[PDB]
Write a protein that binds this ligand. Structure first.
Ligand code: SF4
Ligand code: SF4
Ligand code: FES
Ligand code: FES
Ligand SMILES: [Fe+3]
Ligand SMILES: [Fe+3]
Lengths: 633, 633
């Protein structure tokens, strides 16, 4: 089981699944091997009914697609389509929040409201929207109108790109025609250009991909901003993670997926439904989190995290999960089958995201609280059905400190310098206490033993004094292995990083250091690390491609992660990916994405499947940036 | 060579290619076999880095994707993505025309103008735009603003759907939530819902696909309307087709691709550049057409058609093609390689559609005429370089009567009944002279011997008195085998159809019948047959799914053809596809698309690879509609 996951509770549940004959993601992976080399390398195209076209990586024919598409064209077109799909996911998340805010301030969804008015004012000022003498409701109405308008062509380019990156960075990208014209415009234009008999030049295609990745960034940043306006900006919180956060004696309700719009309401309504759950004979309603929706309610409300990503099925294997409430993205459709063996009620709520065999509750913001009650009532019923059943929850959980938004980080730092809060952090970079900054992002991938790359690379970087922040299921992997527990700072962090974490935490009324890794939220909250990095850039006078900041999608799975890696490259970062992406069938494209892109954006991909090597390479990139600033290392 | 193409000039040029060692689409196809069964059946998914996932059509494992995606989910998601790519192509075509019209009437692109003011007024009235007391330039400005606005969410659904279908049809589609909210909105939402861990219900996914296909329809209809405003509505014209339209003694310039925006300017400017071409020693500039751009200038200006689709390379094999001017869509990137053997200058003109090895001319509407001169000058130079070279143009050409827009058809019919022009046509349906109507649409596919399905099915339907109309490369296939030559009416058409064609043509000052097949334009001008069918629906009081109208993508290749077949099904038509689409790996999805979709839209797919069988099935569907109206058959 140790080749499947490094998580001990996941191993316990894999044993139970094998005992009980429940098929798992790892079993389906085992039945899939050997996987196809054409697809694995990118050398396969189906954008034509003349296809499929396979191109051998090496040897004799076939050497070219039927229409004459070369290997680099096929590879570049495939990658471009996956960037557009990732952009479309983060896009739809943010679009739906934009509609929710619009509905809220127009009196149509009373379950929603402006919870963060300082943020609303910040965003409106950054966008050039006038605040002075305006009603909050009208400022928010303008901010939502701008959000929706960034999806199409207009007078201006995408404001959630051009107003969130330092002007020098915007000038670099715009001299290469990389500034998106509208989010959905870019997605559709990718789909156009990559269809048969269109763009057939790898450089041209990859430039389009960089532009589309920035559309994805805009969607992430939009979603973050709007969820913060709607639901509050995260501040540091203490909670727990892993399967042991489940309780045999409560109604256990997992919120799963990505959009917090419904699950924040679920969190707030379950509090009221406590008394009714307890009339059914439960101790209460125990809302836990899975994947990014879970991270949203962990960041804002301290909801404990049950599990993430490749291991989501294992929550159900305990027999104590009574409801799994989905919205969309990264939900294994297998849950709906597995529920028939475990008694969990799987509930979808989004019209475009349904799974055959799952109960559907048609969620509308205009009836949010009503929907919530209905859904939790189903959960309560399911708990009744397992009154006295034996459950096996592994008694494994870690302590998690999280809620480190960029605003929270800046406030924490301001306790060391109120008038120039980024300065303490910059000072410790300059004197070597902080070697650089590494963002861990992305998901788990069944091909990599779960969390192994995240934890190995993290361990090496922390010993070398790299400040580590994390999002999405990368945050999830690090939190389930103790990396967000301050009590591990001694074992994990080199002396200088230890000193800075201790200084900031003791200055923040915690009596202890900050945790070894700063949890910055969901996959859309990858934009938060942009806002931090951008701010450092601005405070220092230099473009992003000169900062000792790096990013690692250590176990990337989802098309969203490919779009995110591509916009970490486009805004200027060295960007490790720890899973093989479908680029190795073409040397020209690999060369562009790992080398010559440096001469356009300053970022570049680092493709490295071995995590010790990947950590060396990330440390080398950080130290190259240090030397470029004239710093020691 | 006869198993490759049924076109005699294509066979001559295949012989020359084999002689001279030039690789062709058919050779690359031969090197591709045996093709992959997973892709061919749809049972393959790469929307995850955990992939590729192959699912055996039959047998043991693998039976499910790694994430638990079933076979019908994988198949439905693949098909949905190809509908969105087709929609994105027709979408971008129409978007670019919308921007061109906007630029024209704002004084920014003087090479463009309102050429059809009657059409502009029609469109503005159909859209609810006010015409009375308005400047043309301001009406057109409103019409372009509405065009651009149909790409995103707004007060209203997509007007190029809801104002072009009969209200009963709009009510049917809207009771199923199939009315698109914005063209690019639908494309992005498909990309969202089909990415990993989202929609996992085949019915839900296929309903999304129908909605996206209607976005594609909107894009087609928009593109038609705007090109008609900008460039004139086609009226009947006489021209020629096939390779013999090339002339050894002229500068031979092929316009190739889909957007007429540049090639109409090329047509008009080459007239002036005649004298300069003839100073180089040519007889003149001979502009010929390939694929849909060619069909646009054939429809409007009588430009002769050289070739289409699977056989486009053969134009270059003559050695007499001096320039091939591309915009985008269905251009085999092989042209750019083959040009090095044939001396043709391949010129791309669109920023998102470049081919490695081709000269790029950056075309801007604001400098259209200038760009044209530059491009034709390159053509002229290339002609000089082959002064005295031997060329082999096959002396094979057919006579083509074309330009049968819906307006042209209605005018022609109005010579038999001025006050009720659809009535003569309806009368002859009712008395059996016209059995029904069949639209041939789509491309050629290297798997089908070129034009064989189009010509076989056409022959059978014409003998049974079916009125046949055609677009795109289906129009191309029928025109190159004589089906748009009135002199073949006797050999081709049954007695009643012959009588109606003779009556209309002799009433239209032609002294002969109309041609056996009505050429209605490009792939976007598939919308023209909608406008005709809709009008018949409205004139008769019945929904489209009650008319004896059918559609056949007899040799479909491009993702655009899949979107077109899907919106011919969604607006209510029996819709034959003559190439295997990637649906056979899932019986549920095949059942939905060929049977149970009848109970939603009234249309259905007819998948039939044998053309004699396909013609039987199309005749049976037409006669089923006849019986449903209570007619004889
Ligand atoms: S677009 Fe080209 S490479 Fe792709 S399937 Fe079609 S013929 Fe093959
Ligand atoms: S989305 Fe599912 S079926 Fe598709 S590649 Fe990923 S794991 Fe396999
Ligand atoms: S041949 Fe395996 S990915 Fe297509
Ligand atoms: S396995 Fe051949 S299409 Fe993927
Ligand atoms: Fe996840
Ligand atoms: Fe074509």
């Amino acid at each position: 089981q140790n080749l499947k996951s490094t998580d001990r509770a996941v191993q316990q549940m894999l044993d139970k699944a094998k005992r009980e004959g429940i098929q798992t993601v790892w079993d389906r992976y085992e039945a899939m091997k050997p996987q196809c080399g054409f697809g694995e390398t990118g050398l396969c195209c189906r954008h034509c009914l003349q296809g499929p076209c396979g191109i051998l990586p090496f040897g004799d024919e076939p050497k070219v697609g039927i229409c004459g598409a070369t290997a680099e064209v096929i590879v570049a077109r495939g990658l471009d389509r996956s960037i557009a799909a990732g952009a479309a996911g983060h896009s739809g998340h943010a679009k739906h929040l934009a509609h929710t805010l619009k509905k809220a301030v127009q009196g149509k969804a009373a379950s929603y409201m402006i919870k963060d008015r300082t943020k609303l004012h910040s965003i409106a000022k950054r966008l050039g929207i006038p605040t002075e003498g305006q009603k909050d409701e009208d400022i928010a109405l303008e901010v939502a109108k701008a959000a929706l308008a960034d999806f199409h062509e207009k007078d201006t380019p995408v404001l959630w790109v051009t107003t969130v990156l330092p002007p020098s960075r915007v000038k670099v990208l715009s001299a290469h025609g990389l500034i998106p014209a509208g989010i959905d415009h870019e997605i559709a234009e990718i789909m156009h250009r990559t269809s048969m008999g269109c763009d057939a030049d790898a450089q041209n295609l990859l430039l389009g991909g960089l532009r589309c990745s920035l559309a994805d960034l805009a969607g992430c940043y939009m979603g973050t901003d709007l969820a913060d306006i709607l639901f509050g900006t995260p501040a540091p919180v203490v909670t727990e993670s892993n399967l042991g956060v489940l309780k045999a004696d409560a109604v256990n309700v997992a919120v799963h997926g990505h959009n917090p719009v419904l699950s924040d309401i679920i969190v707030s309504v379950s509090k009221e439904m406590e008394n009714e759950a307890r009339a059914a004979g439960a101790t209460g309603i125990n809302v836990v989190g899975i994947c990014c929706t879970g991270n949203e309610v962990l960041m804002r409300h301290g909801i404990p995290a049950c599990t993430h990503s490749v291991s989501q099925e294992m929550a159900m294997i305990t027999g104590a999960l009574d409801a799994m409430i989905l919205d969309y993205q990264c939900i294994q459709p297998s849950v709906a089958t597995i529920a028939e063996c475990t008694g969990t009620t799987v509930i979808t709520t989004m019209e475009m995201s349904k799974i055959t065999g799952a109960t559907h509750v048609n969620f509308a913001e205009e009836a949010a609280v009503e929907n919530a009650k209905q859904i939790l009532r189903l959960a309560i019923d399911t708990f009744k059905r397992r009154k006295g059943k034996p459950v096996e929850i592994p008694n494994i959980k870690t302590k998690v400190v999280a809620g480190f938004s960029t605003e929270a980080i800046i406030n924490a730092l301001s306790k060391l310098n109120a008038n120039d809060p980024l300065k303490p952090l910059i000072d410790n970079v300059v004197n070597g206490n902080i070697r650089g900054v590494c963002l861990f992002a992305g998901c788990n991938n069944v091909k990599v033993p779960q969390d192994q790359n995240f934890t190995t690379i993290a361990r090496k970087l922390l010993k070398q004094n790299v400040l580590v922040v994390a999002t999405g299921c990368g945050a999830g992997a690090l939190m389930r292995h103790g990396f967000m527990d301050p009590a591990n700072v001694d074992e994990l962090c080199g002396d200088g990083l230890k000193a800075v974490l201790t200084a900031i935490g003791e200055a923040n009324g915690l009596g202890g250091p900050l945790p070894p890794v700063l949890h910055m939220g969901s996959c859309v909250d990858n934009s938060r690390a942009v806002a931090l990095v951008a701010a450092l850039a601005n405070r220092l006078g230099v473009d992003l491609d000169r900062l000792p900041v790096v990013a690692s999608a250590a176990e990337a799975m989802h098309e969203k992660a490919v779009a995110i890696g591509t916009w970490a490259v486009t805004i200027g970062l060295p960007t490790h990916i720890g899973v093989l992406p479908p680029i190795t069938g073409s040397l020209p494209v690999t060369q562009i994405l790992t080398s010559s892109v440096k001469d356009i954006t300053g970022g570049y991909f680092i493709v490295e499947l071995d995590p010790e090597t990947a950590a060396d390479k990330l440390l080398a990139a950080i130290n190259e940036r240090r030397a470029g600033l004239g710093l020691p290392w």
